[PDB]
Amino acid sequence: VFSGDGKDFYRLSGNVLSYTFQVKINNDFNYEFYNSTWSYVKHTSTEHT
Amino acid sequence: TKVEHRCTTNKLSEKHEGSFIQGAEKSISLIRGGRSEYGAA
């Protein structure tokens, strides 16, 4: 067989029913992101004369 | 003579600030055929 990948000829045994040289590449990506931020202020005063 | 003067005073304040963001991405891809160098690419 001539492999269309790695670009070479190869020999096969009578033990293998089929050696194919198809290519498939299947990719799945998941990227998930969070960010959060807070700020707070309180003040009081109580006064006399 | 007698005189007296008196007072009381009070004050309050607040401030708040807030932020959030969220992102999500997915990719799914099937390549069939290629040399796996560029099928990879």
Residue numbers in the entry:
A (entry chain C): 146 to 194
B (entry chain B): 393 to 433
Sentences from the paper on this structure:
Given the extensive cross-links observed between the chaperones and C9 (and Source data file), we subtracted density corresponding to proteins C5b6, C7, and C8 from the raw EM images and focused our refinement on the C9 component of the complex. We also observe a second belt of density below the C9 epidermal growth factor (EGF) domains. We then plotted the location of complement protein residues in our 3C9-sMAC model that uniquely cross-link to each chaperone. We find that cross-links between clusterin and C9 congregate around the two extra densities observed in our focus-refined map. By contrast, unique cross-links between vitronectin and C9 lie on the back face of the map. Taken together, our data demonstrate that clusterin likely occupies some or all of the extra density present above the C9 LDL domains in our focus-refined map. The electrostatic surface potential of the clusterin core model reveals a contiguous patch of positive charge, complementary to the surface charge of C9 at the interface with clusterin in sMAC. Density for clusterin at this site is the most well resolved in the 3C9-sMAC maps; therefore, the interaction is likely secured through repeated contacts across oligomers.
Soluble MAC (sMAC) is an immune activation complex that is formed from MAC assembly precursors released into plasma and scavenged by blood-based chaperones. In accordance with lower resolution studies, we find that C5b supports the assembly of complement proteins (C6, C7, C8, and C9) into an arc-like arrangement of MACPF domains. As the molecular weights of secreted clusterin and vitronectin are ~80 kDa and ~75 kDa, respectively, we attribute this excess to multiple copies of both these chaperones. These data confirm that sMAC is a heterogeneous assembly comprising a single copy of a conserved core complex (C5b6, C7, and C8) together with multiple copies of C9, clusterin and vitronectin in a mixture of stoichiometries.
